[PDB]
Amino acid sequence: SYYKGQTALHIAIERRNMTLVTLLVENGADVQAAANGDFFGFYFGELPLSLAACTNQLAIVKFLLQNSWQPADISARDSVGNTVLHALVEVADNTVDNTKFVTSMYNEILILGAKLHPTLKLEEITNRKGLTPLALAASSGKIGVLAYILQREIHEPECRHLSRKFTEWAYGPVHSSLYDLSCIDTCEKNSVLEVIAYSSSETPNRHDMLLVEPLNRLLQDKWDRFVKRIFYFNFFVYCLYMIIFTAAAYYRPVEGLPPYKLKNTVGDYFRVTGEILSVSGGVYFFFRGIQYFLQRRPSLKSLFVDSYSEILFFVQSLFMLVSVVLYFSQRKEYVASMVFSLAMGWTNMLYYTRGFQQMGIYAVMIEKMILRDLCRFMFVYLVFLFGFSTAVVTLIEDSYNSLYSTCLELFKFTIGMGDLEFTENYDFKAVFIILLLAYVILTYILLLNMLIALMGETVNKIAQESKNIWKLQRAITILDTEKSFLKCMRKAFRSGKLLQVGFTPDGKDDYRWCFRVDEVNWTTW
């Protein structure tokens, strides 16, 4: 268990003993066997080669792989399925010192893989989770490793056939490049964009992980090419839907009991069409919301943190299904659900303000102040409201005649809309005035200005990063639009081209997807 399979070879490798590791395999020890346990704590991989690679010993890994007695298996995996390349990503921590180390080790092991086994390529393999090393880095938040992988070029002609970025030419400050995107967009198992966008938001760098070289241009290309007009068509159709729904709700029949007979006039025929369209849009939104949860199946812990704008479009349709249920049940209450679905719909146009760079932070602020600032302030305020309300209604039993009425009358004190009258006589009126004066000072002055100062901090903290927030919300929209229609992706021609630019050591010409990009830097001459 704890020491299952671990030998003096592992200790020597961890101890930086070149002689001990050499003698271990010189005697005849086999490195293929791997040690696993609960401690295996620090996860450096089970294969000894993975441990040596992760422990800053390139000489040791070279010796193990070149060992004539028993060369190490480069593509071995543990029971779970992590490979050596996966282990390298698993140990990155985004720090400047660590990034250079891990990138260097990754590059060296990759070059060794090509030199030893040109026929096989080791980067394509996937673990049990099924995500390739770049995908694993993207999902796990390792911006440094992802940046290294996405844009790396090997100038050695023999080792230049496994690079991602085939530089096309450089002409002064500008350095035209030709990236791969061979598994960034439209890769079956997973895409590097999908894992970045569909993250728990606990992943640290997702906001700043879309500034990487190919991803920025790739997303700004999909937006400019075809998505920016699909989004505006969607916004315009939602505007038409809300106008029709508002018109049909405003002009609803008022005398009678539902359902209503169809009067043979144009004014009442238009209203039935409006009702039909409003309900049909309430089924489209229902099915879209259901489909979202089936595919994503988000954790109930983080249901509102990451899918706040998908819960609201689902609720705005639940309120209308609940009204078409009560409208055919001969219940007049269908209106109490319809107008809630009406106020839901209009304020849901703040979802479409993420298609505008400057206008897209008000939606983010409203969302973040309702979940963080305003939600955990309701247990602090409610003890005050219910304590000074029970106290006030008990004192004057002998407006403040009920618990509901007293709660309402003291809530208006909190928001400065209440009147300290004291006109009506009460028994114990010197302690009633003291109670109300304490309540107003505590809630209106002291406690309501604490919320106003805590929401100000939130606004200040998420108004500096407007560029960061905007681009991720745009990437999510691009992903959703692309995935919505299959023929859209099929005819999108997302990759810049499908070109043959090099030949593998096997002697067969290789053609792959790629996308030319450009950048400008002349400071280095």
Ligand X SMILES: C=C(C)[C@]12C[C@@H](C)[C@@]34O[C@](Cc5ccccc5)(O[C@@H]1[C@@H]3C=C(COC(=O)Cc1ccc(O)c(OC)c1)C[C@]1(O)C(=O)C(C)=C[C@@H]41)O2
Ligand Y SMILES: CCCCCCCC/C=C\CCCCCCCC(=O)O[C@H](COC(=O)CCCCCCCCCCCCCCC)COP(=O)(O)OCCN
Ligand Z SMILES: CCCCCCCC/C=C\CCCCCCCC(=O)O[C@H](COC(=O)CCCCCCCCCCCCCCC)COP(=O)([O-])OCC[N+](C)(C)C
Q: Which residues from 266-325 bind ligand X, rule CB under 6 A?
A: 308-309, 311-313, 315
Indicate whether 416 belongs to the interface with its own copies (CB under 8 A): yes
Interface pattern 385-404 for ligand Y (x via CB under 6 A): -----------------x-x
Residues of each annotated binding site for resiniferatoxin: 308-309, 347, 354
478 binds, among ligand Y, ligand X, its own copies, none (CB under 5 to 8 A by kind): none
Edge-to-edge strand ranges of the sheet holding 509-517: 169-171, 174-179, 509-517, 497-503
> 516 has which bridge partners?
178
Dist CA 42 CA 306 (whole Å): 30
Cβ neighbours of residue 334 closer than 8 Å, sequence gap 6 or more: 258, 323, 324, 325, 326, 327
Sequence-ordered alpha helix ranges (H) in 348-447: 360-368, 378-395, 403-414, 429-439
Q: Which is nearer to ligand X, 362 or 485 (CB)?
A: 362
Instruction: Kindly state the number of chain residues that form the binding site for its own copies, as judged by CB under 8 A.
Output: 93
240 touches which of ligand Z, ligand Y, ligand X, none (CB within 5 to 8 A by kind)?
A: ligand Z
Query: Which element (helix H / strand E) includes 473?
Result: helix 466-484
Closer of 49 and 385 to ligand X (Cβ): 385
**Structural tokens at position 29:** 């020890």
234 binds ligand Z (CB under 6 A): yes
Q: Is beta strand 174-179 parallel, antiparallel or unpaired with respect to 497-503?
A: unpaired
Pick left, alpha or beta for residue 428 (phi over 0 → left; psi -120 to 50 → alpha; otherwise beta): left
Q: Which stretch binds ligand Z (CB under 6 A): 73-81, 101-109, 236-244, 407-415?
A: 236-244
User: HSE (CB half, 13 Å, CA atoms) of 481?
Assistant: 22
Contact 438, 388 (CB under 8 A): yes
Task: Indicate whether 133 belongs to the interface with ligand Z (CB under 6 A).
Answer: no
CA angle 100, 105, 109 (to 5 degrees): 150
| Shortest spacing between CB 458 and its own copies, in angstroms | 9
Residue numbers preceding breaks in the chain (C to N > 2.5 A): 40, 398
Residue type at 439 in one-letter notation: Y
Among 226, 285, 388, 513, binds ligand Z (CB under 6 A): 285
CB nearer to its own copies: pick between 73 and 168: 168
Two tokens at 119? 């026929």
- For residues 397-436, which are near ligand X according to CB under 6 A? 435
Least separation, in Å, of the C-beta of 240 and ligand X?
Answer: 18
For residue 255, give the 3-state DSSP assignment: coil
Whether the CB-CB separation of 53 and 84 falls below 8 Å is answered with: yes
Nearer to its own copies, 106 or 388 (CB): 388
Question: Is the CB of residue 463 less than 8 Å from the CB of residue 476?
Answer: no
For ligand X, which residue of 78, 194, 275, 367 counts as binding (CB under 6 A)? 367
> Which is nearer to its own copies, 188 or 255 (by Cβ)?
255
From the list its own copies, ligand Y, ligand Z, none, which binds 238 (C-beta under 5 to 8 Å, kind-based)?
ligand Z
CB of 42 to its own copies, least distance (A): 5
Binding marks (x or -) toward ligand Z, 348..367, rule CB under 6 A?
---x----------------
Which residues are registered as beta bridge partners of 83?
77
d(C-alpha 382, C-alpha 23), whole Å: 72
Question: What residues are paired with 77 via a beta bridge?
Answer: 83
Binding track, positions 431-470, relative to ligand Y; x by CB under 6 A = --xx--xx--x-----------------------------
Give the integer Cα–Cα distance in Å for 47 and 136: 19
Task: Tell me whether strands 169-171 and 509-517 are parallel, antiparallel or unpaired.
Answer: unpaired
Minimum distance, C-beta of residue 274 to ligand Z, in the bound complex (Å): 10
Site for its own copies in 439-478 (CB under 8 A): 440-442, 444-457, 459-460, 463
Residues 22-51 that bind its own copies (CB under 8 A): 39, 41-42, 44
The answer to the question of residue 257 lying near ligand Y (CB under 6 A) is no
Which parts of this chain interact with ligand Z (CB under 6 A)?
234, 237-238, 240-241, 244, 277, 280-281, 284-285, 288, 309-310, 313, 351
Residues making contact with ligand Y (CB under 6 A)? 304-305, 370-371, 374-375, 378, 402, 404-405, 407-408, 411, 430, 433-434, 437-438, 441
